[PDB]
Subunit: 317 residues, 4 copies
Amino acid sequence: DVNTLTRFVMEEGRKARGTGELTQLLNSLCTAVKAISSAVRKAGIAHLYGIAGKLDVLSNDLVMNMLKSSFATCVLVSEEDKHAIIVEPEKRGKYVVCFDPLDGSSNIDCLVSVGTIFGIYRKKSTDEPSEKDALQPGRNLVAAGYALYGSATMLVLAMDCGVNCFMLDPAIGEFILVDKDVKIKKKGKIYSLNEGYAKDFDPAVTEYIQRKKFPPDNSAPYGARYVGSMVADVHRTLVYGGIFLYPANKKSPNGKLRLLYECNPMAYVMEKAGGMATTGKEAVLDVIPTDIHQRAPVILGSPDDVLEFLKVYEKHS
Amino acid sequence: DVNTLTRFVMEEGRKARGTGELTQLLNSLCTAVKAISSAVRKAGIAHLYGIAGVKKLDVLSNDLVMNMLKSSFATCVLVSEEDKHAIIVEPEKRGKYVVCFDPLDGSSNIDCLVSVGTIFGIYRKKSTDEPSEKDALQPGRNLVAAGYALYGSATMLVLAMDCGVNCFMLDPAIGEFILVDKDVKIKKKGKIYSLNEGYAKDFDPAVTEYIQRKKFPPDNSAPYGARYVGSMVADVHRTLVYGGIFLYPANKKSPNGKLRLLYECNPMAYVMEKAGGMATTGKEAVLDVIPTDIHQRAPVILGSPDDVLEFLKVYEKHS
Amino acid sequence: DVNTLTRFVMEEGRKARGTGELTQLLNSLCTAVKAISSAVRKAGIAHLYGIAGKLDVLSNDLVMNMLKSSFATCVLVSEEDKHAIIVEPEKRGKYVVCFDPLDGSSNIDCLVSVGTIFGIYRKKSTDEPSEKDALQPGRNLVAAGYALYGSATMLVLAMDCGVNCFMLDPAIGEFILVDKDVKIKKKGKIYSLNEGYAKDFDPAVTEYIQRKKFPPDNSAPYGARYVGSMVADVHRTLVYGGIFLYPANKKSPNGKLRLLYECNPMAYVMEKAGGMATTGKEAVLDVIPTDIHQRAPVILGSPDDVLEFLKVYEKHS
Amino acid sequence: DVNTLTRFVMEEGRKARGTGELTQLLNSLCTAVKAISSAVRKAGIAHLYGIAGKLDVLSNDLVMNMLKSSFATCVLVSEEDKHAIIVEPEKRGKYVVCFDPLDGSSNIDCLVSVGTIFGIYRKKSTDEPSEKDALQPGRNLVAAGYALYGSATMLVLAMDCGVNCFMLDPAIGEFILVDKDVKIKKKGKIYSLNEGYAKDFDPAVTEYIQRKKFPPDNSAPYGARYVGSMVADVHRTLVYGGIFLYPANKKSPNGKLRLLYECNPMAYVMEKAGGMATTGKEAVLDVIPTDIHQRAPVILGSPDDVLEFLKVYEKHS
Ligand SMILES: COCCc1sc(S(=O)(=O)NC(=O)Nc2ncc(Br)s2)cc1C
Ligand SMILES: COCCc1sc(S(=O)(=O)NC(=O)Nc2ncc(Br)s2)cc1C
Ligand SMILES: COCCc1sc(S(=O)(=O)NC(=O)Nc2ncc(Br)s2)cc1C
Ligand SMILES: COCCc1sc(S(=O)(=O)NC(=O)Nc2ncc(Br)s2)cc1C
């Protein structure tokens, strides 16, 4: 049987006997993703070049407005906004959404894959909403995922029931369920990180990478891929197995990627798919944030690969 | 004033006072590129998943380019990554051009929605003999036009001719390629290197040393960043837009590289040179290699001239 | 605030505190209508013409399959199917849907506007589902409407809350709320019927049309429009007012249009918009059917114009 | 072999060994038509209704800017413009284009079919370009035709080589040739006119319509169709045969449709398809215009039907 994103979400919502607030949340977000996708693929650019005589701001506005008007949110945290947005009282719902509206857009000049990342938490207080409602560990995530604007557009949605992948059919504007209850391979054959900054590596990362290229047990060398767009590399890791690293070093002891709207959603997708996600010191989902824009190191992917990196990390005390 | 690919090609054709065969050629390729883009973005996939109650993308892509080029009446010999032998166009549809193309490069990893692309190179048939596979064995210096479509976050067609390199963005709402970047030039020197460092144990010593100099510069300057998509069109386009260097070099297991000379290396080498970049195998210019086999491989190092020159200096230190 | 069809229906569903089944049905129909519009506009026609070396059947399959897989239906009546379709037990829901998957498609060779018409009933007995469950008067409709595939694609949805019009945005595949709680004019200036068959007219139809062209007083004669496609003529009647007639005569004493999936849904839309719909003898919505494909005469539109027609009709009785 | 609009025009152009100017014009016109088609279908309407927080004018701007920038035109007459537009000196070419950028858009509130109509002349005088260069009879047309934005978008192009029909495939933005060297039926079975003006009809029109409804020779009466959008009514006349009439009435004693960019292009298409187009007094294409927006009565379509009307017209002197 064919299934769509909206029908899938409604059926899971009905099973859970929920009120519908989360469904309204996701349906609005799905609409914003379709509008982002259309602009990313440059529909209407002929009018910009005068046929009749920005993108990351629009993406933020599309997500902000669709979530606000959904009546399911009260606090919105965005890569694009210095402070958390508080939904106006008459529009308030019970959910907090942290999102990166258009990740990778710094390099969109070369048409690199880009994506939208989102994580959804339930509000913690019964009081007036505040930024504190966004300062939850990832363990409390109710749902998370991302849209990948790659050769085609795909939305990956992770919840308690697992991870499901939906392909956007642009002919009809519907996300089609194409991969159900996906699980990452136990062990992959690809590592992904910016090796150009090797001069700064932590000793453990230097050693772990050394083992991928010159395996001690005669086994085959790993291949290397690094798009430089986090959603594209994390999605490749999910589909093919392997490991993705944006680790801590001396110049960046807490990493570069953002915990609330990059690290935590991807870790949740990974764990629901049977993978792992560590900062080196602890599971990503266990870091308790004190700032909405704080950074975290991240190593994630196939469990045998993350376990192997953690073994090397532990050897270096 | 707005410009489109078709309007661009016609006006250049009129300047040159040609017969129109090349314009008919490029317009047919353009049409195939839009149909490939439409299929790559998965338009209509809901029907494959039973919305009402089936071919492979690289086979469909090859059929699109083949049929549009045959039906243009502008071609006589067609070389495709997908066909062991050259296709010789039937007599009533024959024109004067030879086209080498990779209909969907990078589709090996299309399971992960990696950027993919179409690569093409266009030659004038040179002899009066009957057309045969031999007419495709010209060095890249003989290219009349070349370029690629990149199906990335957006679809873009990059067209290189003697007048320079021009970039056209596909507007999907109207199906037109809009000229968005005119006469593009690559930076003299970049800050990105691009290759599969996972296979370092097999590197040529010159490659090992050069990568060493990028990560640990002797002159203390900032280390280069590293990017490698694993899809040639995406990595080369980033090299063209941001500068730097792309390497797919020879080693002892692969003394002739892995990428194919006729429909991957030569078209990309040609685009790079028309943008003021460089493309070498280490031993010679990519465009000067005289091929003997239409599917033969070639090592390729390309990009910003200063970065490729620095590779050649290290490569020379290793004789 | 922007609104979509799915978001609108969800909000009305939560207001009514229903189970979610009707929302699941309408979301399924909406996906089907987007697929029909895409095919009607000839997406992919290049492949049928050899670039790489049915419409009403496809339309029927899209609606049947999306409704079946919705888990919201038990009996489906279609213009295309001789007998009612009974949904298999594992997919049965509580609604009966009568529909015309592609009305007007006989003349689609000239690219005339075409459309999809639907009507939704609640199954009334606990018996095994059967064709008899579709033989309810239109008064029993829970929801009805039509998709018009015209210069643009529009979904008109009528429920107890009134009539609402949604425009399909093809760039994102969403039905956008553009006209809320629409009402038809009290009196129009257009009449619509096939005047080519005047030799067969009932005397009352002949007299009423003669008065529209030759008014007894000084007022302006009505203009005439007849597309020949029911959804287009009825929709123009909705937007501009006036009267649409496909009446009974001696050769066709029960009319030509079908009651279940053409007359009743349109009659329902008209009455929720403040209009009227009569067979001449009684309201269309009060006819109790005895056959799923039975015909009914229909005269509909602005109430003053239908009342004026009934006055002439009664003069000849 | 598959064929497209651009490839067809290039191939016919090379056959004639022309310079390419007309091809550049028609290619520019095709580009504007696809943009008009996308706008008519409401692409991007979601942004007008706040998803992120004038059609006939846009249509005219698209055609004007695309034709000016083609370097193939020198004088442009548009339904939207009071005076002929004189192309600036550096962009002037040898062609004059009369066009209706969005015909029927008055009633687009009901999503009625609309269309673009065009006629193309070679400039005939050696004077400086002026409004007078647009005043040639339709006999002088080099090319003409129309785009119909109906259930699908279709371009009909008539030249000396005959009439050809191209279907826009919206998935790739290309006009696909689907009907080659089309000919109209010798006699049709549909008549088309606004019968609401019956009180103002000339005796010849009244008699002819009477003959369609009450045939003297026992034959079947014609059916009636009238969309009220000329491109839709004319296109149907071409595809199915029959007759289209817009005669003069009291509001319009010189007729209502405009000679330059409605009557002539359609008359030209009709004659190249083996049909007919008369004012009653003379062939439409032979009328010598004196004013760029002047009106004309028009009767057109299948030749046996237009000849039958002329018989009645001669009977009434
Ligand atoms: C981990 O995710 C838990 C699963 C849940 S729970 C919700 S919900 O709370 O929004 N409830 C509902 O939507 N109920 C409904 N009733 C009728 C309709 Br028609 S939808 C959504 C999802 C995806
Ligand atoms: C390096 O390439 C040189 C540039 C060239 S030369 C040609 S051509 O040979 O095809 N000639 C023509 O197209 N003539 C025409 N006449 C009228 C029209 Br309308 S187009 C195409 C291009 C892009
Ligand atoms: C005659 O009906 C008019 C009003 C109604 S009642 C229904 S319903 O029965 O399907 N109930 C629901 O959809 N409940 C929901 N809960 C959560 C979500 Br989220 S939707 C749909 C409509 C449009
Ligand atoms: C009066 O209609 C006769 C048919 C004609 S003649 C012209 S034209 O004058 O524009 N010439 C050309 O287009 N030449 C070209 N050379 C190369 C390419 Br490729 S096209 C267009 C059409 C449709």
